[PDB]
Amino acid sequence: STPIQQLLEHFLRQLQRKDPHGFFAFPVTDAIAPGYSMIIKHPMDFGTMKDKIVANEYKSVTEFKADFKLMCDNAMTYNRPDTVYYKLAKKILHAGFKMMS
Numbered sequence: 005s006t007p008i009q010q011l012l013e014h015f016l017r018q019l020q021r022k023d024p025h026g027f028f029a030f031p032v033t034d035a036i037a038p039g040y041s042m043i044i045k046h047p048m049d050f051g052t053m054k055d056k057i058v059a060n061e062y063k064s065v066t067e068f069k070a071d072f073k074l075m076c077d078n079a080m081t082y083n084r085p086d087t088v089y090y091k092l093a094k095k096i097l098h099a100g101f102k103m104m105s
């Protein structure tokens with residue numbers, strides 16, 4: 005396990021603690037979010053991120069941060085602003101980027 009993998013696994017643990025319901029834990033299904041796959045072109049979730057870290061697919065922190073932002077942006081695009089998902093996405097995007105400095 006490389007130094008970048010160790011750091012990313014660390015950041016990921018810290019980020020996932022901010023989503024105690026695990027709304028962002030696994031790919032969003034069309035069943036729970038109708039028409040999701042026809043709206044969101046590039047889905048992302050923490051489970052997929054973990055698998056990318058394990059596969060050594062991230063070669064910079066920048067790349068990891070981009071997938072995190074993608075996840076949050078997806079939630080903010082698909083959901084109306086008055087929803088728990090949108091509000092949590094906006095909260096964790098800011099907190100996560102700060103956290104990661």
Ligand SMILES: CCn1cc(-c2cccc(C(F)(F)F)c2)c2sc(/C(N)=N/C3CCS(=O)(=O)CC3)cc2c1=O
Pocket residue numbers: 026027028032036037038078079082083084087089
């Ligand atoms: C943040 C990612 N995400 C996750 C979910 C989700 C995943 C697992 C379990 C649950 C549940 F058990 F709590 F329901 C929700 C959902 S569900 C959803 C959905 N059905 N959202 C609607 C909210 C009302 S609206 O904005 O009018 C249309 C979309 C969007 C997302 C999502 O982005």
